Amino acid sequence: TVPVALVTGAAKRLGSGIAEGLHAEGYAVCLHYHRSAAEANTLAATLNARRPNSAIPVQADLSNVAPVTLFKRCADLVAACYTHWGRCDVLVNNREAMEAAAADLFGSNAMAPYFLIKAFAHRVADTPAEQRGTNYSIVNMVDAMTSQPLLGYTIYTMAKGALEGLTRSAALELAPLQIRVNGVGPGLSAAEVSDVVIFLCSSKAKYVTGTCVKVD
Amino acid sequence: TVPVALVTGAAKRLGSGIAEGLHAEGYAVCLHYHRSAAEANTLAATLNARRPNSAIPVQADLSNVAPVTLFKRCADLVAACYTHWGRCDVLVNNREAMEAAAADLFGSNAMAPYFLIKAFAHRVADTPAEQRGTNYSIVNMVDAMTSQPLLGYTIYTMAKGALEGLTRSAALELAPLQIRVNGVGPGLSAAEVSDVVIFLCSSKAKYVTGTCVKVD
Amino acid sequence: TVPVALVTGAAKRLGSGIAEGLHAEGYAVCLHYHRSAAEANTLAATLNARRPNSAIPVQADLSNVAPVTLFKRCADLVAACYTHWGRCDVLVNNASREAMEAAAADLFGSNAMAPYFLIKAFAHRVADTPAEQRGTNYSIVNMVDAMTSQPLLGYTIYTMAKGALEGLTRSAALELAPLQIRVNGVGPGLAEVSDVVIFLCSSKAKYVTGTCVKVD
Amino acid sequence: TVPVALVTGAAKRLGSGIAEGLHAEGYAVCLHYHRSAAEANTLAATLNARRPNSAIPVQADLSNVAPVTLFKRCADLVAACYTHWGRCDVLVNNASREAMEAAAADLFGSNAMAPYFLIKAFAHRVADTPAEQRGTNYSIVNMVDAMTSQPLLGYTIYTMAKGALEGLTRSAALELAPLQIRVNGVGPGLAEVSDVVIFLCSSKAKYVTGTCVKVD
């Protein structure tokens, strides 16, 4: 046993902090990326150097269109974890021009987590009982407006809403396989949300599912 | 003054009833369709015959991909109403194979209403003060599971959630232009929801916005 | 065989409107008051003037405090309808140092419990009526008032009270649904409101229950 | 300068766990009881056994009913911490014919108001402390119990009570945020729970407030 965490958007502002923090706790991290390959590798450099083969970068396109389906690209991201360490215990989902753009950011921000969670669960489902880890938890992040800046009020509230239903609904559907699913949002530092994430992923939080954490 | 209602999915089971009912009340209806052109025209036949030039069918593709954006296809649907009657007072939003499908049904069911509402409001915004109608209301329908049958529990709950936030958020954002926005869902006949829709669209409901109606 | 409506706090302001509006639709009205005799009798006379035997005033303390229990007082008020007219089809619940604090407690409990008990009695009376002898459209409306119109309450205790009342509405809807009794609420958005009341009570709302209507 | 925690209903079952758990983290604990003297003294002795001057029992009636007002009783219980230890940093609120009905009313008001008043007093004490002299981590936890563990309540009145309590949590969080006092809730999903309490009270939750944690 050494547990494994997949942090999507792992080189972004938040994701990195979550990643540093899950790694400090003794998790092996998969550091997901699209655009930011260099920073992925810096981060992987820093952690592996601190503790060897404890981190991998992995590129994945989390957009609405990459013809390869998002459903499949998502399943492949989770697969990177199994190929490389053979388990995945933790998932953290972190003008016409403008309009089509906002609609697409809406789609992947709801649909990527959905498919990343189908995938995560499918694998746990397939792992045999004896060889399953003991503490599977999924955290959906939701963000302030400042961090979804290319936004009007309304679209943001739609995305929060679906994310909100993802969390409560999977919490339920996925309890038979012992998978907790929780959320962290604002609120009506990076170091800060990280402690929440660490607690929800910790053994302390075994009986906690369905819960939308609020922060500041 | 004779008010105008746009009922998307207007030949489907529910939509038709809503349409017959808004028309009985004295609304001129635009009967939206994609696949079901024949039934659109039967319905238009029945109402115009009952009361002349009081109904038009209009085809629109409400899918996620029809390269023409949904944003634009939506704006064009609302435009059909203005071209033909010069006003629009009422909007009613009514295997990899399987997965991409569900993701797409998710996208258009959240995003079509969003863009149908941007469009509706834009026009009202552009109409001059003197020539605006007096009672603009928008109703978002949400449906039982039986009517979104190609579904798992979770996806359905995501869509409800975004729809839910659309309704509350626009209610707010769109109150300066006097546009009420409300929802009708189940519940935790066709004739039945129709009366709710008629009331929310009626002058009786002037001070009602933000409200999610529940039914049975 | 003319429907009967029980409006608590009929004597002054929102109560009167609602009673007046309901009366103008042809219910017989029972106008509860506590301290405002002039107002309840004046109003009842006016109404009885317009249509004979159509209104009565009925006195009750609905504060929270045998010396008579709140339950019994609430049961007798509901009984004053049967006695007088044979039936009761509609209930509208209008909410109305160390010293401020105990009074703010008393108020809180009074606003939650009086409706709770009223709803209990109403419903027990329905259940005692032989099956074939019941009315065809039982509905209950819980009014929530703006923070600004009940000045003795801090933000917190107000929210508490709003929370108790939403619970009762949603709870009682589910719990009474077998007796075909609908329970709904009118509250402020984020005779104005009498039309919503008329609607919820109307035969057109036969399937609306457990709804919190938002009015501003 | 050792932190002090006030647990209502410490005497039996969930209360004891929580007090025990909090105590095992090194708070000084004030163990409220009403009727169960044996339980509160036994437990306090055990704890004081393990570490001297680390626990005391303190008696209070927290029912809803000068003859002493609930407010004053709640103020004095909170005062029994200052008096004894100089400070109070953590509050945990554990909820615990015609006749059943009046008792079910009394219970309801007691469960909403006792916490409300407790939170008032706690917070007044914080505010009277000169600025530079306050503790660094004030937190409040409102426990909600399962329907099954408080048998005297119908579904409806329970939901009412749950609603009052969620209101207080979310309300008091916003209202006390200027005094750097956090308010959160633990409730059932749709020493198990002591770890969540420890967490919410811990320095790692400095930015968590207004959260309803869901535990089953």
From TrEMBL, chains A, B:
Task: List GO molecular-function terms, semicolon-separated.
Answer: pteridine reductase activity
A Pfam family it matches: adh_short_C2
* Sequence positions that bind substrate: 137
Which top-rank group of organisms is this from? Eukaryota
**CDD domains, alphabetized:** PR_SDR_c
Q: Keywords for this entry?
A: Oxidoreductase
Q: Which residues participate directly in catalysis?
A: 156 (proton acceptor)
Enzyme Commission identifier(s): 1.5.1.33
Q: Which family does it belong to?
A: Belongs to the short-chain dehydrogenases/reductases (SDR) family.
Which PANTHER family has this protein been placed in?
A: OXIDOREDUCTASE, SHORT-CHAIN DEHYDROGENASE/REDUCTASE FAMILY (AFU_ORTHOLOGUE AFUA_5G02870), SHORT-CHAIN DEHYDROGENASE_REDUCTASE FAMILY PROTEIN
Please give the NCBIfam families that the UniProt record associates with this protein.
pter_reduc_Leis
**Identification of the protein by name:** Pteridine reductase
What lineage does the source organism belong to? Eukaryota, Discoba, Euglenozoa, Kinetoplastea, Metakinetoplastina
